[PDB]
Amino acid sequence: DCSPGIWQLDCTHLEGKVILVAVHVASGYIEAEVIPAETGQETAYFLLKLAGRWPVKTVHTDNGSNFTSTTVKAACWWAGIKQEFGIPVIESMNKELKKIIGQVRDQAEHLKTAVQMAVFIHNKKRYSAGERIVDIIATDI
Amino acid sequence: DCSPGIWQLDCTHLEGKVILVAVHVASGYIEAEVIPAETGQETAYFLLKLAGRWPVKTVHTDNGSNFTSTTVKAACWWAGIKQEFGIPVIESMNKELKKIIGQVRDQAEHLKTAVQMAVFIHNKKRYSAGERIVDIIATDI
């Protein structure tokens, strides 16, 4: 959890929709996306996007069956991502995100937009989570 | 262009599909996404995602009419993003991205995946663009 390369991935539901939530464990920085279904293809596609922006070395999840998909294993293999085993946080983070979404829900037509507005508010809330991840990654370099 | 908050947004086409490409001007770091159509709604949604991850203060584009959409102005207003006027780079960057996509195209079924694999290769190519943006943002803090 001290290591700057540990992320946690989890899908949560809201308004009959699926939200994929990634948390940088050391900083609390969040990325979220509404996906059409809880499929390995959506997970694999999200991991490639995440690995292209940040250093992703190991990933954890609260539902191990999420990572059994052959498509997910292919994406982790290509990007050099290992499965994390040192975590026996997202409960709090998912409830935290669902709360901020409720505050901004009225300001956006679709749930798509509310999720990104909530991610914006979380990462800048104030150091902020957005500043802390950059600081953590910078020193590690 | 020295300022760490300047981004450039442009849509490019490949295989009858639209790719939205964002470039961090000071570092050369890239984010890209295949979008269904060149609409203001897709642009506005992409900007909110970008502003939630990085500090986005001003944005430039090669096609000014991209930013006339009332939906785009609403997103820039809510996230506190101004239109950049100090740039009279994406030509090179879009050709660079299209080249890397061609190298990896055979390794992925859909163009969606090839674009993210190309973004991955660009930002880690090696400092790398992914390291340089974090360093730039860190010192600015």
CA-based torsion, A69, A31, B125, B105: positive or negative: positive
Cα–Cα dist B31/B24, whole Å: 9
Q: Does the beta-carbon distance from B130 to A53 stay under 8 Å? A: yes
Chain B residues closer than 8 Å to A97 by CB: none
In the three-class reduction of DSSP (H, G, I as helix; E, B as strand; rest coil), residue A56 is classed as coil
Chain A CB within 8 Å of residue B42 CB: no
Task: Show the tokens assigned to B5.
Answer: 């908050």
Give the other-Cβ count within 10 Å of A74's Cβ: 15
Chain B CB within 8 Å of residue A48 CB: yes
All structural domains of chain A: 1-141 (3.30.420.10)
Q: Does the beta-carbon distance from A119 to B31 stay under 8 Å? A: no
Given resolution (angstroms): 2.5
Secondary structure element (H or E) that encloses residue A101, with its range: helix A90-104
Residues 69-108 of A with CB under 8 A from B: 78-79, 107
Which is nearest to A81 in space by CA: A110, A65, A61? A61
Which of B48, B107, B116 shows the shortest C-beta gap to A120? Answer: B48
Label each residue of B65-133 as H, E or C: HHHCCHHHHHHHHHHCCEECCCCCCHHHHHHHHHHHHHHHHHHCCCHHHHHHHHHHHHHCCCCCHHHHH
Burial class of residue B14, CB neighbours in 10 A (0-12, 13-18, 19+): middle
Task: Show the tokens assigned to A126.
Answer: 């104030």
Partners of A21 in the beta sheet? A10, A32
